[PDB]
Curated annotation (Swiss-Prot):
It comes from Yersinia pestis. This is Iron-binding protein YfeA. The gene is yfeA. Monomer. GO terms for cellular component: periplasmic space. GO terms for molecular function: metal ion binding.
Length: 272
């Protein structure tokens, strides 16, 4: 056979996690495309029809998708589920969104296990005919995620503790940084139309000076120009691109959530 159970997700990371749980018994599609900015995405009429055709809608919550609640108002009779349920938020530390949840919880692979469980539960509840495929796929995929911890830590193990400074454009790596003992510095705390970046750019250059930070990075859905300037004004090498808010295309270097975590840690590690 019939027309398969259809899941629509707001962005690509959730799409890939959900598709691993769904296997071939459900079809999972993302509203946003690879490479597109997800926080302030502007949905189109095509997007309403796509979401309205789903049997279940998955979104991040933690107000990642500033567009979603207004968007969902146009969708009728389709259940939605927040895939971060039960995750404890790290607060945004500075700027006009200080004190709001940092939404990038998927960058901690231990948090990913909670994403998987929330998605499994939603799939089993709303598609009970395939409960055993979902439960089997979710346990197998959770073991793939747990198996990342040892190679990831080993990959970062050369960098001594007080050299572990991670300097990015968006402050999108706070969950990854807490997991692996890095201190975070960023050019802006969360993607948004905002003031303060040129004054934050001076501050970052300042903090690179004091601590002799060797590398700075950018991310794949935003501009590399601020990070490349900070590298020019310091001696630090420009290390990016890092992946957090989007996968690549299916043929690019980051087609899956696992490849996103691995390539991001790999790129950090080679910068030092
Ligand atoms: Mn439900
Ligand atoms: Mn982001």
């Amino acid at each position: 056979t019939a027309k398969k159970f259809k899941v629509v997700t707001t962005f690509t990371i959730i799409q890939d996690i959900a598709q691993n749980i769904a296997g071939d018994v459900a079809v999972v599609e993302s509203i946003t495309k690879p490479g597109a900015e997800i926080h302030d995405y502007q949905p189109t009429p095509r997007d309403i029809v796509k979401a309205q055709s789903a049997d279940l809608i998955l979104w991040n919550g933690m107000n990642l998708e500033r567009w979603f609640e207004k968007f969902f108002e146009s969708i009728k009779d389709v259940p939605s589920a927040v895939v971060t349920a039960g995750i404890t938020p790290l607060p945004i530390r500075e700027g006009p969104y200080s004190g709001i949840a940092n939404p990038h919880a998927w960058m901690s692979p231990s948090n990913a296990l909670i994403y998987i469980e929330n998605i499994r539960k939603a799939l089993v509840e709303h598609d009970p005919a395939h409960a055993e495929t979902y439960n089997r796929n979710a346990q197998a995929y959770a073991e793939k995620i747990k198996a990342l911890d040892a190679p990831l830590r080993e990959r970062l193990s050369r960098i001594p503790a007080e050299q572990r400074w991670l300097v990015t454009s968006e402050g999108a790596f706070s969950y990854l940084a807490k997991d692996y003992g890095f201190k975070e510095v960023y050019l802006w705390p969360i993607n948004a139309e905002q003031q303060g970046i040129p004054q934050q750019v001076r501050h970052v250059i300042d903090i690179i000076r004091e601590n002799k930070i060797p590398v700075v990075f950018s991310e794949s859905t935003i501009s590399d120009k601020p990070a490349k300037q900070v590298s020019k004004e310091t001696g630090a090498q420009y290390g990016g691109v890092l992946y957090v808010d989007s996968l690549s295309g299916e043929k690019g270097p980051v087609p899956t959530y696992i490849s996103l975590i691995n390539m991001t840690v790999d790129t950090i590690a080679k910068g030092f």
